[PDB]
Ligand binder design. Structure first.
Ligand code: NAG
Lengths: 199, 111
């Protein structure tokens, strides 16, 4: 079935994950019009690393993954190789050798309420940085000192997750952005994900 | 923090005045290779292409990675949100190819 990749299911999903609990959808055995995404005009960020966005329709890949989550506008810059900060270190980390596109759009109209949207969380604390594409959904109380923690919150013993408050009248830097990260894998196996214009 | 800084964030103008929006690709090693402007009317959600035509004039300084849209002889139909998109398509000093976009300018025109 040489039929269109279900990119609609990723980009137009009703629900998006919290960044700490970021979704990964495997895409295979389908034809993908990357140009319609790139030329869309809904997106505020579209950055392709190790591949030109205008040649995507001409390439085939072994596997495509679509990772998706919500962050604040001024965190979108952290979804890039080499970056540091709460998001890049403790929630979602790209490898230094990343091949793929980082795509984002303002989602203020979907992910802010009147009185503010409190449904989204991010990991604030961790013992070390995530490895590329690592996911940590643990709620173990974080031990910031020598003193053991025993699952109990105290003066150096922190709950590791905090809530985004998405206020609708805030500045764009504080607004929610939906993000999709496409990773392109080219291995020694049959290439199952192709543009319309590829062999 | 690699971003496009679009100023002003909001303006109110009288019909007949002109307005200038300035964008600069900040905190980037990336070249500015092309630009694009979009408008949504007041109370609409559709992002639509600007024409680069009679009332709308564009400036670009590629070295400084800055550009501007000037709209002359404003009307009330001009009221809405303007977005600038900055393209980097060379792949030298930039790790990436594609676009990043301003936060927008919310324009209100009275009469
Ligand atoms: C999601 O939004 C609308 C559906 O009515 C459509 O214009 C757009 O292509 C969709 N996005 C995709 C398929 O990536």
């Amino acid at each position: 079935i040489t039929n269109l990749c279900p990119f609609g299911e990723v980009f137009n999903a009703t629900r998006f994950a919290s960044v700490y609990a970021w979704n990964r959808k495997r895409i295979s055995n389908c034809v993908a019009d990357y140009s319609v995404l790139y030329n869309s005009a809904s997106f505020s960020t579209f950055k392709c690393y190790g591949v030109s966005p205008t040649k995507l329709n001409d390439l085939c890949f072994t596997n495509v993954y679509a990772d998706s989550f919500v962050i604040r506008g001024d965190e979108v810059r952290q979804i890039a190789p080499g970056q540091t900060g709460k998001i890049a270190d403790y929630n979602y980390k790209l490898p230094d050798d990343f091949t793929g596109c980082v795509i984002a759009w303002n989602s203020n109209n979907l992910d802010s309420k009147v009185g503010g949207n409190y449904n989204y969380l991010y990991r604030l604390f961790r013992k070390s940085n995530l490895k590329p594409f690592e996911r940590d959904i643990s709620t173990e109380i974080y031990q910031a000192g020598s003193t053991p923690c025993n699952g109990v919150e105290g003066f150096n013993c922190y709950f590791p997750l905090q809530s985004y408050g998405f206020q609708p009248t805030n500045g764009v830097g504080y607004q929610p952005y939906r993000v999709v990260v496409l990773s392109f894998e080219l291995l020694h196996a049959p290439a199952t994900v192709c543009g319309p214009a590829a062999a | 923090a690699e971003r496009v800084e679009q100023t002003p964030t909001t303006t109110t103008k009288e019909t007949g005045e002109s307005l200038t929006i300035n964008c600069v690709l900040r905190d980037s090693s990336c070249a500015l290779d092309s630009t694009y402007w979009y408008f949504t009317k007041k109370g609409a959600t559709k992002k639509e292409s600007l024409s680069n035509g009679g009332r709308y004039a564009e400036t670009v300084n590629k070295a400084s990675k800055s550009f501007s849209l000037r709209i002359s002889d404003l009307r009330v139909e001009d009221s809405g949100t303007y977005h600038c998109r900055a393209y980097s398509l060379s792949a030298g000093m930039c790790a990436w190819m594609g676009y990043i976009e301003g936060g927008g300018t919310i324009v209100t025109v009275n009469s």
